[PDB]
Amino acid sequence: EQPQVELFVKAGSDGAKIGNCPFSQRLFMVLWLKGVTFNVTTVDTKRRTETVQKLCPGGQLPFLLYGTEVHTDTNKIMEFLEAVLCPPRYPKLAALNPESNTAGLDIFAKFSAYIKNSNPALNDNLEKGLLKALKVLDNYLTSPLPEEVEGVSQRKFLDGNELTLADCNLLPKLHIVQVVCKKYRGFTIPEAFRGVHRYLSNAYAREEFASTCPDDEEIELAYEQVAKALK
């Protein structure tokens, strides 16, 4: 008998819609992939419900209610979920190859530096840094994993042809990178990074990812005071 599973996530600008938060998306995605029956409740952090205040006094977001147990810390929540929702009833989502768990994880810090910088003399250095991080990801994607034995992998995702926890982490981060770089830097992931573009097409084709993305407009609004014009 499945204990009740309810994920509390960041609300967006109207207090109700999906807010910008790659951690909330990461977990919505894990739960979707597990096949478990769950609920998702958005939280307006300036206008919290009484239930939320009692469930999670610390105020952290996302958090999970599992039966009457609360869990904070996205990574720990992810671990918990991978362990308790397990086969036979639910699929193991962990990657087979440990480097799937790290591939592309530096892109986000590179992106953050790029968009926060206002020193024009430093802008091309930061762009190059983000580009090199994307290219290390493009290389991981196009390199055949063991389970595949031209030399260009055609697997759909980071670890193989199925979505794993690893994609649930990276895909929400890459999404923000795309939307915010287009809007504030006029920067686009070069078409020549074909592994990265095949991955994203595959990902946007899957509802687990598409359906759990905040709107562009919300991501853009979230970065409005943080993205700096060069001066």
Structural domains in the chain? 1-94 (3.40.30.10), 95-231 (1.20.1050.10)
CB atoms within 10 A of CB 216: 14
Parallel/antiparallel/unpaired status of strands 39-43 and 63-66? unpaired
Q: At what angle do helices 120-142 and 194-205 cross, to 10 degrees?
A: 70
In the chain, where does DSSP find H-type helix? Answer: 22-34, 50-55, 74-84, 107-116, 120-142, 165-185, 194-205, 207-210, 216-222
Known binding-site residues equal 21, 61, 74
Buried b (16+ CB within 10 A) or exposed e, 83-115: eebeeeebeebbbebeebbebbebbbebbbebb
Known binding-site residues for glutathione equal 21, 61, 74
- Extract the tokens encoding 13: 């600008």
Grouping H, G, I as helix, E, B as strand and the rest as coil, residue 102 is coil
DSSP state of 7: E
- Extract the tokens encoding 3: 């204990």
- C-alpha–C-alpha distance, residues 149 and 47, integer Å: 54
Method: X-ray
Q: Pick the closest to residue 15 from 40, 48, 39 (CA basis).
A: 48
